[PDB]
Each structure stands twice: as C-alpha cells, then as structure tokens.
Symmetry: D2
Subunit: 429 residues, 4 copies
C-alpha cells in the first residue's frame, strides 16, 4: 500500500471532531461519499464514460484526513497514477480534493416556508466556497453541453470560450469533459491574450454524477452541491448569462429546467441572456431541438433565446453587451450581482426525483398544462434516463427490471423519442 500526503493550498484547519466525522468505518455512510468523490476528482481526464467500472478499478484506494502543524493533510492510499505528473499530484486536483473536503463538511454540519431554506443552502454553500464575488461588472456566463461530443464541437466550443475570454468573461460548467471543458481551455488562452489576471472557471458537480463526469483539470473553483436539483439551481442563480452547446440527454434536462423558470410569469422582468450555439453541422441538430420545445412549450420559448450557428465571436460579443443590462436589472430589484435572489424558481422544480419505473410512470406530459408544470416534470424524465445511462442505480434499475418508455402524447412523444434516437445517432450516450 503506497501512500502520498497532500498539502493545503490555502490555510485550512479542522478540529479533531470534524475529522472524526470522516474517520474510516464500515457503518458511517459519510466516509464513502467523501471517498468516492475524492476518487472521481483523481480520475480527471478519464478516457471512459461508464461510472460503474471506475469504482471497480480503484477499490484499494482510500483517503485519511490528518491534522498537522500547518493544518490539514490528505493521506491518499493507492491513488491513481494518471492523476500525477512526475511523481507529484497535479495541483488542480489537489485544490479539487480540498474543495471536496470543504463542501462535504459544510453541507453536513448545516443539516445538523420550505423553498426559502433550500435556496439559502445553495447560497450558503457558494458563499462558504468563496465563489460569490463580482468585479466592476458581472461577467459570469455558464456553459452547458454534453460529455461525449464531436471533434468539431470541441473546437467550436474552444473558439467560443476564447472569444468569451477575450472580452473578459468567466465560465461556469458542470466540470465535465467534452463540451464542459472545451470553453475553459479557450477562455484560458483568451484571458492570456487580454492579460486577464484572475480567471474563474467554476465547476459545479454533485455526488451522484461526479463519478461518471470527472472534474476536468481546467476547473479552478470546484463546488459540490448536495443533489441534482440544487446544482441546477446554483447554475441559474450564479449566472449572468447562459450558452448551451449540443449535448446528450443531460444537456436537454438543463435546457428545460431553466426554460421552466423564464416562462413563469413571475419572472417576466428578469433579464438572463441565452444563446444556443453550435458549429456548421449542428444546424439540423438545433432545428430538431427547437421543433421540440416549440411543440412542447409553444412558440413562447423563442422569446427568451436566440440560435446562432458557426460563430464564436458574435455570441461572445452579444454576451458581453448583455452584462450592462444584466447589471442594470439587478439594481432595479435591489438584488445582488453575484447571486440572483429575485428570480423565482417554483417549488415544483426544486423537488428531488429518484428515478424508478414506478415513479417514471405517473409523469404528467400532456400539452394541456401550464408551460411550467410540463417542463418541470418533463425534465424529470431526462433526469431519469441520465441515471439509467450513467449512474449505478438507474443503470441497475433499468438493467434488472426493464427500460423506461412510460408516458405518450401527440407530437411530444413523437418528439421525445425523436430526440434520443436523434441523440444516439451521434453517440451522445
């Protein structure tokens, strides 16, 4: 059993009682969650997609938290060698590990209306991560995209980040590979071209997806949200602008969850730019997704977004010119620049979902509905098959007792399976 001991980057101190919460036992669940999250960080740049196999490869790996003279040390037992560069752990992965130690301890010490308490946990987690700060102008634009993406979609996703970084704007993704790291490498060379001295590449993951989508090495501010819904909520609240790239089913869910918030009449005065961008060959891909949400949510969905094709400079130029309007709107409310408190996320979009055939059953998918409740629970169906696609329980539940094809309707069921078939075509998992 070969070990390695990692130092803190910023002075970090624990008590003998906080470390004991992480002490290795077979009865305390909390170590396991801390152990696997640490393992996922160490498999950054994973050459695979499956999440069941990565744990089965590093089983003798473990982690001990230590209290030394200068603070906390992470004693890593049998760490993956691909995390090292010449016998030393890549310092981004070191910072990610201590971010995992920071968030896990916080989200569990705080546990020990109801919608106000949830958004505040999101606010308190980002604040404790020191991830809530604005410069002279808000510049945080989050980017959504798939994991297994094209070679041209990657280059296009790098060109957009470079033109975004050239205009001094920061990126926030779900810290995954593919379209979730390509804009960061572009922005890394973009900030270098304009001498932007303080880049913030925020990766926001959560335990149940971190093993399938390992945090890419370009992330410099990683935050662990408790579950899927709070990570989605953190996205739109820390955001000043959104750009969406072609992606698998996980990207579809993100688009609806958000679209279920701008279409709420309680958010008619909120400003939030959204551009769906893609390379030359994503023209057909985008038309089939527009024809989706224009058949699901009506033609109202096109008043809140614009689609641009084969252009990196325009979507960055238009995203930059939106920050003054974003800034101005935060002041009229009296809101904050670094956190959108005023936007109303309905309690039906904050509620969690554990994917089962049983619960995938009674999904309300009729176009009858208020635009909100349809997309609110339609995105649950996408959350269900990402679990069936990537994560241990959804894969297993879909393995043993069958697949999910549960609720039909007019075009939308024509369109639902139009998409996943139009998704498997380009191998989007």
């Amino acid at each position: 059993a070969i070990t390695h001991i990692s130092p803190l980057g910023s002075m970090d101190m624990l008590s003998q009682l906080e470390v004991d919460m992480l002490k290795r036992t077979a009865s305390s669940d909390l170590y396991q969650l801390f152990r696997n999250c640490s393992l996922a960080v160490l498999n950054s740049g994973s050459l695979t997609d499956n999440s069941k196999e990565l744990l089965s490869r590093f089983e003798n790996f473990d982690i001990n938290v230590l209290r030394r003279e200068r603070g906390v040390k992470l004693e890593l037992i049998n760490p993956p060698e691909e995390a090292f560069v010449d016998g030393r752990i890549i310092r981004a992965l070191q910072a990610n590990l201590f971010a995992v130690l920071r968030d896990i301890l916080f989200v569990y010490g705080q546990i020990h209306d109801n919608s106000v308490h949830i958004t505040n946990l999101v606010f308190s987690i980002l604040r404790n991560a020191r991830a809530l700060h604005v410069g002279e102008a808000p510049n945080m634009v989050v980017c959504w995209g798939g994991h297994s993406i094209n070679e041209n979609e990657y280059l296009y996703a790098r060109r957009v980040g470079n033109q975004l970084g050239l205009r001094e704007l920061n990126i926030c993704t779900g810290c995954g590979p593919g379209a979730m790291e390509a804009p960061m490498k572009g922005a890394a060379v973009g900030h270098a071209q304009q001498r932007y001295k303080d880049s913030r590449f925020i990766g926001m993951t959560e335990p149940s997806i971190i093993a399938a989508e390992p945090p890419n090495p370009l992330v410099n501010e990683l935050i662990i949200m408790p579950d899927i819904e709070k990570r989605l909520e953190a996205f739109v609240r820390i955001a000043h602008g959104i750009i969406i790239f072609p992606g698998g089913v996980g990207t579809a869910e993100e688009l609806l969850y958000l679209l279920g918030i701008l279409m709420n009449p309680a958010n008619k005065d909120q400003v939030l730019p959204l551009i769906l961008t893609g390379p030359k060959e994503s023209a057909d891909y985008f038309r089939v997704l527009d024809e989706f949400v224009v058949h699901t949510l009506g033609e109202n969905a096109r008043r809140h977004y614009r689609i641009i094709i084969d252009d990196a400079a325009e979507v960055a130029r238009q995203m930059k010119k939106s920050m003054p309007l974003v800034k101005e709107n935060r002041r009229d409310t009296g809101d904050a620049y670094s956190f959108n408190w005023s936007m109303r996320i309905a309690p039906d979009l904050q509620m969690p979902f554990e994917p089962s055939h049983e619960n995938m059953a009674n999904l309300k998918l009729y176009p009858d509905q208020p635009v909100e409740v349809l997309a609110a629970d339609l995105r649950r169906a996408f959350s269900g098959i990402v679990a069936g696609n990537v994560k241990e329980v959804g894969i297993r539940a879909i393995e043993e007792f069958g697949p999910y094809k549960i609720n039909g309707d007019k075009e939308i069921m024509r369109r639902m399976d139009d998409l996943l078939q139009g998704f498997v075509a380009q191998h989007r998992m």
Copy 2:
C-alpha cells in the same frame, strides 16, 4: 437623524434572513447586542470607563444592515463624530464594525460528549471564521496584557517594548483596550516599519460585557468578539505562543491568575509558553507586591512559570523571540497546531462562566486548604467580580443598591489581597 453608509472591503454577503435577525425588532435579541457593540467600536479613544456612560450620550444612535448590489452595507444613524476624520470614518473602525457583524452572526448561528470539548471547539470556530488562525514560517504571536489606566512612563515603556517586539517581526494580540492595551501596538507599528515587516497582525480580543468600558483602540487591525469573559480568556491562551504582562488593575490580575491556574496544572508540565512580567523602573515596587501575593497564595512554585524583567524592553523582546523556536518544536513534537494550542488543558472550572453576586463572592474558596487550581480559579472569579462591580452596569447596580462586595477567605490571604487592591487605587488604576 444623520445618516452615513459604509461599504466593506472583502466579499461579505448576507441573506435576507440573517439581516432580519439584526433588525431593531421584537423577534430576536441580536439587535441590542449588535448595536451596543457597534457603538463601542465608534467610541474608539473615548475617555469613558463605564458602560452606561457610553450609551447615555448617544441615545439616538442606531444601525441598519442593508442588502445591496455588491453585498452587505452598513447604515449608521448619528454615529459618534469622534469616529470621523475630515468627514469620513476611520478605516479601522469601519473594519471593526464588519468584524462585529461577522462575530455576532456566526456565534448565534453556531449556538443553534463533554461540554468542555464543545467550548474549546467553539472558540476555535470563531477564530477560524474570523481568518485569525494564520501562521507564517514561525510562530510569532505575542499576547500582551496590561492596565487600561496607566502612567505615561508605563505607556512609553510598553510602547518601547512593542517597538522592540516589532523589530524582531513579532505580532501583538491584546484585549483591544486603551493604555497598556494600546501602547505595544503603536510601538510594533513603528517596529514593523523599521524592519519593513509587511503583514502586521494586531489582534484585538473583546467581549460584549467589557467592550463599552474599553472601546477597541484604532491600532487594532483584527478585532475578535468572543461570546463572554471566559471564552476570551481561553482565546488568549490558545492563539498565544508567548505572553507579556505589564502593570495593570484587577483586569490584569484576573488574567494573571487565570494563566497561572493553567500553567500550574501538571497536565501542562510539557507545555512551552514563555511568560514575562515587565514594567518600567517605578513598577519595581508594584511587581514586588504582586509577586509576593501570587507567591503566597499559589506557592513559591509559581515563579517557575514567569520572569520579571524591569526597565529592559530589548531584553523582553529578545527573550520571547528566542523562545519562539522552542514553541515551534513543542507544537511539532505533539502533532499540535502552530496557530492554535489544542494540547493545552483548560480545566472546566476555568471555562465555567461566573456571574458576580454578593453570595458568589462571599462563598469563594480562598483558603489555603484548597489545591492551587481551586485557589487560582476562585481568585480569578473574585477579581472578575471586582471588574464587574467597577465598570459594568450589572455590578455597579448591585453594588450601588446592596453595598460593596464582601469576599471571605483566609485572614492572611485577604490581608494581602486587600493590601494589593489599595495600591491599585493609590496608583489611579481602578477607583
């Protein structure tokens, strides 16, 4: 109703719910504590010694906490004009106000097997949250204790000591008051400039019951509000790697008796904490009476823990600078932390809060029959009660209405404690 808005320096954001906790309201009692602590901050340099006298003038003073575009923002209503220079607040007081806001919110949010373990962990948490547990390449934090009402000779000597301490790149922690709580910081500020020392840390530690009597001096750059008297005493011993005690009153005696009670515990026999008592030429008679009192009550094995250096500021600073490598190795050889002494054992009786009543003071076990830990703990309480009955409303009210305190003990021990406390009055330290 004159209004002044003061934003802050870092990233400080509050929810609407934490701001609601501090509104002048009948829903939670944080406002009267947060407003009184804020008013004491703005009375820096005030020649006042009582608490009621501070609140008596500024009656129309209030403070709101606003949530705006770039985070928290404090709105002060008729603040003391002495807090201004050329129409702008002194920046030290502005940062102190945001430290009051930080410490009041965190403590009350954290309140909501042993209790001794949890008290020490609370102390550590407040310091951790205040970004106060920082250590360079070597431990260099030197706690200085002294009187709020001192001579100009003692003030100059204390500033000369702090100047020598600053020349050796040592930092200063203090009870943040005036007098000998301010002089070493003024000296270290010049000393650090002479050695071009960049990141000076002048930690002030106060608590709600004393902050109005001894408002934080403007030389403090790191204010910490501990929840009460006992946990601020604990804070001193934990952050310190060396302690210096100038001449002072009962507040200085309380801190002295507290520290001796810890050092004389056999569980701390392997603990390195250099303790130097120092003063100018005239303080020789002072330290002789003080030493004789400690040496009688606690035994002649008390001088094992302190040294008395008189009229030598360079030697005081030289001795503690030489002692820091010893502290570093002591922490190293026990897995302990450089910036927070976990290994030091504080008996629960030293952590137990004490309310000065006429009956509690009369039932202190000041007799030679008791062990030294019981003696030092109860002597701490006795002095703590004299502090309250002198500068705090709950003590002044109870004394001015039921009579002065009457402590009971051995007729020789109290004969010496009396003799000393009258020197305190004679040198214009307390009454």
Copy 3:
C-alpha cells in the same frame, strides 16, 4: 483620420526630450523604425506571410507619443481594426506597443575588448525590460520553429507546450506565428492546470523581421533586440533549455548558430539541453536535417542533442529533469541563473551580415574547417535567404539582380539544396 489613445499598464514616464526623439519628421530615421515596429505589433495574427505588402496596406497609419498627467499615452492614427476587440485594443498588443517604446528608447540612448560590450548590451536590454529573473529553480526553455507550419505540427507544438507548462516551465520564442506561438497556447492551458500563477511567455524579435513575423498575441514579455545576431545571442543566454521544431530556413539558421557555440572547446563544461522534437510525419524531415549537420559538422553534433518523435510528455519530462543540472552548473562557474555569462560566443558569430550576392559570394563552406567557422558562416547563408524570402532588401536584391546559389562543395552542397527543396516541398517559405 480616426485616432485612439492607449494607456500604460505599468506607470511609464518620459521627458519632453525623449519624446522629441520620436517626433514625426521626414528627416529623423528613428520615428520610422518606431512607427513600423508599432505597426507590426498591431497586425498580430496576420493571415499573410509577405512583409512588403503589410506596410503598403497601412500607410496612413502613424503614432504620436504623448506626455499626460499619469505618464505616457500612445496616440494611434488609423490603427488596424483587426487589433481591436469591440472597439478596444487587445491589451497584449497594448503591452507590446509600450515594450516597443521602451526598447527603442533604450537601445538608442545607450549608443549615445569589443565582444564584451556586445553581450553587455544584450544583458542591459533584457535587464531594462525586467526580463532577467529566476524563481527557486531555472525554468526558461526557448522553442524554435517555423512560421508557416503544418496543422499536425501546430497541434504537436501545442501538446509539447502543455506538457512543458504542466511541469511549471516557461517558454521563449521569436514571437512569430505557427510553431512560435503554438507552444505558448499549450503552456497557457498547462500553467492553468497546475495553477502556475505567473507565466512568462517571452517573445524576442528584432526590427528587420518583426514585419514579416508579427508578434503573436500569446506573448506577455516582448523584447526588441537591435539586430539579428543579438536576438540570437539573447536566445541562448536567457535559455536554460532549447527545443527545436520543424521549420523553414529561419529555423535552420537558429540551429547552426547555436551548434556553433556548443562545439567550441571553450564550452565543453557548459550544460544546455537540446531536443529536436516533431510529430509522426516529421521522421523523414528530421533524418534529412541530421544527415545535414552530421555531414557538415561531423558526428560530433549528436553528442549535444537528442531527437524524439511523436512525444510531448517525454521531451517535457526530460527538459524538467535537466533544470537541476542546469542550476548546478551555473553555480560551479559562479554564473547567474537568469543569464548565461560563462558561455563563450565566438566573435565570428556575433558579427552582423547584410545579405548581398556580393557578400554571399566569398562564403567559406569547405568541410576543411574548424567546426566553428563553418557553421558560423554557414548560418550567414541561411540569414541571407531569409532576407531574400521575407524582408524588403533581400527580396528586392534577389528580385532585381538574381538569386543566391554561390558556394558549392561535396555533400554539403548536395545537402544545402537538398534542404531548401526538402523545405519548399511542405511550403515552408
């Protein structure tokens, strides 16, 4: 005539008399040199290679130096729009302009043994540019390569820089496009992966080549050396390691000029790593260049370099493990980390050369010679055809009065024109 006024990034102050040296006249040569160097900086990322045309496109462009309350302002008349991003000049180009203002004023105020004075001018220029500083360990590796290079050579040149930046090493090129900027973008994302907070991407150009090879935007420390020979000397003295990529004739000259310094017996104890690296398809290209300098300089040339193919991590890993040996050797001499004083550059390699048929005539190219004098003047032949290829006088002199094919010998003349024909094959200019 539309203008724009640029601010200094670091407080820069001139006197009324230093600016008058730059005052616009038709008789003072010095403004022209300052004007065109400023123009070349503004054409960063040029889509062309020719240097005669770029001046002919921006003739109404001019520059005035101003003395204002907070120091120097650059008043740019009719600047190229491609230098701007949304109506504001890219800040790297701003820093490059003030570096041009800094160096030009210095190299001309200092003018107003002989080999010791030359190296000291090089030292004083780098020192005045604040470009001579070393961290705990020397980490400056310079990279040489062509301008018009492959798409695979660019990606490979980006992979090497990323693995170089992953090991916390800095880059120094001649600030050109192609293989001279690809390692910088790789190192930009490499330093971001290891949280290297202070990258130094040193571009070193000189007046007579800056217009054909515009300073790429990835340069953060640009220095203008007076001529071709001093820029070559600055390279090997500020260097702790060298890596050479496939390139045109300009890259050949750099390889020999250097190789004429390690083969000097006075430099037998000097350590300086050199790796010639290239992608999969540069295997034949490298064998024809080895068979060149092994037929020109003997088999002695292979004791000072090693050739690795289709590997970015090894040449970075071996370049990193060389820094302790580089460091150790600088101490045994009592030399400096940031400037190699001890290395002896023969006066025959410091002497300038103005390319003419007349002076390309009496080149001594017999393999008779001491290894030093052959390569010393053999690299002049390469300096002559780069001038014939890219720069106004060499192009013109070759235009009006014929090409240069002047001195023959055994294999080496077989090998000389073996190369330029083996260079035009892949369009290396």
Copy 4:
C-alpha cells in the same frame, strides 16, 4: 575582519564591469563614495553630527559587491554593530544599501541645449530609475523640512503632525535625517496603520556631502541619493505637492530661502504649492524672528506664499489634505505630471552648485539693491556655507585653519541674520 553577506529583495543584476567600477581600486573613484555612503547608512540613529567623526571609528570597515547565482550580493566587512538586531541587520538599512548601490551606479553611468534643462532631466532620471515617481488616484506626497537637533516638544509635535497627515492618507518626503526629519515619519506610520493605509511611502532624500552628518533614519522606506546639494533641493520641489517646515537650523533656513526664491518668481504665479510653517507653542517666538527676517530681506510679499500654524497639528494636516485636489487640477490644466512638477521654473542660479570659500561668502550680494531672486539665491548660498563650515570636513578644515566665515551685506540685513543665527545657537540647534 568580520564578514556579513546581505542579499536583496527584487531583481538586481550587475555586469562584471559595473562591479569592477566599485572595487577598492585605483581605476575609478566610485569606491570611496560608495563605501562612505554605505557606512553612513549603517550608522542610522548615530548621535554624531560631523562627517569625520563617523569615519574615524569604523576605519577597518569596507564593502565588496559580489556577483552570484541570483544576482547582486553585498559583502560587508566589520559593519557597525548598531545596525544589527539579534545578529541580523535591520531590513531598512539593507534596502538603503541597495539604494546606495543603485543611485551611485546610475548617476555615474548617466554622466558618461541649455544645461538647466539637462540638470532637471537628470533629477527626473534618478527618480525614475529609483521607481520613486508613482502617483495614486490623487497626489499625496508632502515634503517635511525641519532641524536635525530639536526639542522633545518639537519632536512630539512633528510626530503629532505626521500622525495627522497619515490619518488623511498622505505620504511623507524628508531629507532622511534625525529629529524633525524622523518624527513625522514615525507619526505617519501609526497614522497609516489607523486608517489601514497599505502602501506607505516615506521618501528620504540625501546627498554625499550631508549623509554622514545626518544618517538616514530607520523609518525611511525609499532612500534616494542625489548627486549634490542643489539637485536634492530641486528633487524636493519637483516631487512635492505640499511642503511643511518645522523649526530648524541653518539647513532648514537654506531650504526655506531656496523655496521662497522659486515661489516668488513671476513665472510661477500660476503654480499651486501649499506651504505651511508649523511648530509647537514654544516655537511662537521662533517663527516671529524667522518671519521678520524673511519679511524684511525678501519683502512683505513673502507671506503670500506661506502660512504659520502654531500648536495645531490637525489643522496643518487638514489644510494640506484639502489642498491636494487643487494641486491635481493645477497639474491637469497644464498637461503637467502628477508625480513630477515639470512646469515649475527653477532659475539656473538656484541650480548652480556653490562651494563655500572665504571669498565666495564675502562676495554675496546681500544688499537691498538686488532683486529678490538674487537675494534669495545668495541667502541660500550663505546658509549653505554655514552648514558646510559646521558639519562637513571641507568647511570645518577651512574654518579651523583660516578662521570663521565673514559674510558681507547690508548692515541691517546682516544685523537680523546675526540676531537669528544666535537664536539657533541658544536653542542648541547648531553650535
């Protein structure tokens, strides 16, 4: 032969050729200047007033400049022990030594149509090379002049003034000596700490002829060596946006007469440079004699350029802080620079170096027939000669061997100059 090596803080590399210029050698005369300036740096705080007395003790002291792996490195041989604390040099003196090395090399390297233009450009170049021409959002550099030998009352008042100046985020430039050249810096260091002012700039300006008589105080964080007396005087007026003059001796009078000669030039009628003369209560009789002297020789139109504030440190600092926005707009409306006043016209006669000889002092045009510019320039020379004949070897030698200086002038003007200079002696300022 005790040896101590001191590396430096920034990136300072020298060629073998610049190091050869400073070797104890018969090839260039930089060594005796560089060694004497270094020895004066290491004698910070020395109670010595003459130059020969500084060099007399440390006779075996020398200094070499080594070129090593990470740049320049200074090797000092038997340096003054007073420069050490706990066996290490004070960091301010170490940085001063590297400023001496920087200024001696640059000046001598720059030496190798009008001459007035080139003198001003040299002054600007030395400041530019020393990274001393920096301006924040507002001009805040306040030049303070005062005596090297002052009262404790005057020292406290000057420190109280500097404390008030530091509370308004104003920086201090000084002739780097002791006394009133040190007190405002000690005060500003505490003042800057109270306002949490981060980047304090305490510029000390000295020159080879005076540095041994008034060694740089340890509170200076930016030492500048100007080549001689006249160019250091020029440096003061150019970097300053305000000037404060405490009581002093002939050196303070020389600086006063120099500045008045510039302000009274009609070419400077549109120049904003606030000038305040200030002192404690007892200095009232001092400033009355001083004001009467200036007001007689230069005319009653001299008070147009200065104000006398007595026993009010807050008002002095308040007046100059209010004056900085005026200075900023003055520079703005003329295209001039914030950190270096190019527009100020210094007559060549004020730039002309003066060697004090018995004949030059006897042929000064101190008569009311001459214009005020000739009067102020020659009065500057007269006082400059008394400085040399008091604390400098070339003056002390010529006086102790040929007799004291005899200045000639109007029998009323010299009657007042005599009367004043005897007050200087009576208050123990010069002899």
